[PDB]
Design a protein around this ligand. Structure first.
Ligand SMILES: Nc1nnnn1NCc1cccc(OCc2ccccc2)c1
Length: 346
């Protein structure tokens, strides 16, 4: 089999001419030539079967990505694995090759207002579809927004995604969270498990702020730093917003803080389009019940040159896991991954 760095990358015969892109905790990514479609693609080698958590994340993401079909959500083109469960040690996922991501773009490039508007429209268009299926992404951030050389944008990395569950969203103060710190909504640190759609709208707001300035708006170094950043811009919550927080430890922590007044957005972003700032204000609302929903955001005047609800599809049915993937042994998960990937076998 073809080899890359130390490692076997056995994807022949359809895929040849491999080049290293990167590695991570989650596997190795290469580009390759697709001899069938005569284009270069991206392939990720995943080796998850020894670890129950890695199996869960892998199965969840495959199921979601195979079910969704939308221009602004990355798709799975092909999945390569051994013909038998006994011989399957790795899985290779094939996706369209996307040249860059919004994280890399922001590090290196000034965005025009026209690009900011188009990027935001595409994010919200994709998010409308995701939310319409009753799924929450939960880890929206610039590195999970892939771009090609014509600025087509695709949302990726659904490893932390969950079905919405408003009724079970409550929890106590300082509950652990897994998603990326700077893009976590305030309520995560206070009283929320992140099981409602409002947590994704917050993240989009953060992304919009970062596009306007090229830097993260709330770059907290740990928990109460993440909050004290937020409150230094938004100002101290009103009595009405605190009355929403029934848990005493969370409410009394917020009452213990010195008063902060709101910093107006136009002082932070003097070059920004006023319509962009109005929409930003509505996404970065402290109280999640007052936060704008995705459809209202698409209908906002900032996006009027793109808004077309007839070209902003919704899912044909809500999404549900046929099982709870938390309590299954890794051997059962291996079998399920085998079964889900069978449709790509010759
Ligand atoms: N699509 C793409 N182009 N350059 N980078 N990049 N994203 C990384 C990537 C490439 C190929 C396959 C990938 O698979 C991610 C994945 C991992 C587990 C389950 C389902 C999907 C990821």
């Amino acid at each position: 089999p073809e080899m890359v760095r130390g490692q076997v990358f056995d994807v022949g015969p359809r895929y040849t001419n491999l080049s290293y892109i990167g590695e991570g905790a989650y596997g190795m990514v290469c580009s390759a030539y697709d001899n069938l479609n005569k284009v270069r693609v991206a392939i990720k080698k995943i080796s998850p079967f020894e670890h129950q958590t890695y199996c869960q994340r892998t199965l969840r993401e495959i199921k979601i990505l195979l079910r969704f079909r939308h221009e602004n959500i990355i798709g799975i083109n092909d999945i390569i694995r051994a013909p038998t469960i006994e011989q399957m040690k790795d899985v290779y996922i094939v996706q369209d090759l996307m040249e860059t991501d919004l994280y890399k773009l922001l590090k290196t490039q000034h965005l025009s207002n026209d690009h900011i508007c188009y990027f935001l429209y595409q994010i919200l268009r994709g998010l409308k579809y995701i939310h319409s299926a009753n799924v929450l992404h939960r880890d929206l951030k610039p590195s999970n927004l892939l771009l090609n050389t014509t600025c087509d944008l695709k949302i990726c990395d659904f490893g932390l995604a969950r079905v919405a569950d408003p009724d079970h969203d409550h929890t106590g103060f300082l509950t652990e969270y897994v998603a990326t710190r700077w893009y976590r909504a305030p309520e995560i640190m206070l009283n929320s498990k992140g099981y409602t759609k409002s947590i994704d709208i917050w993240s989009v707001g953060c992304i919009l702020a970062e596009m306007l300035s090229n830097r993260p708006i709330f770059p907290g170094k740990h928990y109460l730093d993440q909050l004290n950043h937020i409150l230094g811009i938004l100002g101290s919550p009103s009595q009405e917003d605190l009355n929403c927080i029934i848990n005493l430890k969370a409410r009394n922590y917020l009452l213990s803080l010195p008063h902060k007044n709101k910093v107006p957005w136009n002082r932070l972003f003097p070059n920004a389009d006023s319509k962009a700032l109005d929409l930003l204000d509505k996404m970065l609302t402290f109280n999640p019940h007052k936060r704008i929903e995705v459809e209202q955001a698409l209908a906002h005047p900032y996006l009027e040159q793109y808004y077309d609800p007839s070209d902003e599809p919704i899912a044909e049915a809500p999404f549900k896991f046929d099982m709870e993937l938390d309590d299954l042994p890794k051997e059962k998960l291996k079998e399920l991954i085998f079964e889900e990937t069978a449709r790509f076998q010759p």
